[PDB]
Amino acid sequence: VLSASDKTNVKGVFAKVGGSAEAYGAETLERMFTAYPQTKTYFPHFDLHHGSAQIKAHGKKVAAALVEAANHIDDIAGALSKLSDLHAQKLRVDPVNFKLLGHCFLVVVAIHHPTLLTPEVHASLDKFMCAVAKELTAKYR
């Protein structure tokens, strides 16, 4: 789980992210649909075109959810309860797609905040997004 110092880091970036998390939300999503096009399968109902307001809108929601989880960081589970079910019972997203998503967010925070993304913070934000990944898939294991 999260260390007391992990959380220092996790939160820090998210503030150093701030309200910018609308654009990062999309940028990560687009990076997923480009670098990992087999992810496109899950949004057949979307216009998966660059900039498409769908991926932009969906973007905000995604970061916003992370924003919300790194605030209730002592209780990520309950902060993402409603999503855990959707992502496992309706959607059935393969566990491995979560690895990919986190990866692209780290790429996003690196590009925009490289003088913050130090190995120690690299670790923490992985460890965070691993446990964000885990609780969204609780209906598998």
């Binding site: 480009t34 990992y36 692209c104 780290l106 490289p114």
Partner: protein, 146 residues
């Protein structure tokens, strides 16, 4: 892996501005600290007790260049990666026995060092171009397993 031209351009052109000494060291340093069970394999590098000790360790910082140099070699013969790593397959498979997942981890990490380094110039399609390369290189190491 059927390569695209824009991909080769993207790979070779971003490979252009890469300083392998730093990137390589930083890339390994991040592998050593983020996935600390990888340090098991570099017991011969000595002091890796701390994140601080790892990120200036001459051997890490020296070896890091070695491994990235090797990445470069792929960037040259992109269509012939199978054999560029053929031997370092036996090294990593028969001698060292590293689980191939690590090759992606160290390859996923590489993508992040690249991203922090070249900022907006690292577009999602570039990221994707480099994603394949790294994915190709890890098969080429793995090739001598199954």
């Amino acid at each position: 892996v059927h390569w695209t031209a824009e991909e080769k351009q993207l790979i070779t052109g971003l490979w252009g501005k890469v300083n392998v000494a730093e990137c390589g060291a930083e890339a390994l340093a991040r592998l050593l600290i983020v996935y600390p069970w990888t340090q098991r394999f570099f017991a011969s590098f000595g002091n890796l007790s701390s994140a601080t000790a790892i990120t200036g360790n001459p051997m890490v910082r020296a070896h890091g260049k070695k491994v990235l140099t090797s990445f470069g070699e792929a960037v040259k013969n992109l269509d012939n990666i199978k054999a560029t790593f053929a031997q370092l397959s036996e090294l990593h498979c028969d001698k060292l026995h590293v689980d191939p997942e690590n090759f992606r981890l160290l390859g996923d990490i590489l993508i992040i060092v690249l991203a922090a380094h070249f900022a907006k110039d690292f577009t999602p399609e570039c990221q994707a171009a480099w994603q394949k390369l790294v994915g190709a290189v890890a098969h080429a190491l793995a090739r001598k397993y199954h």
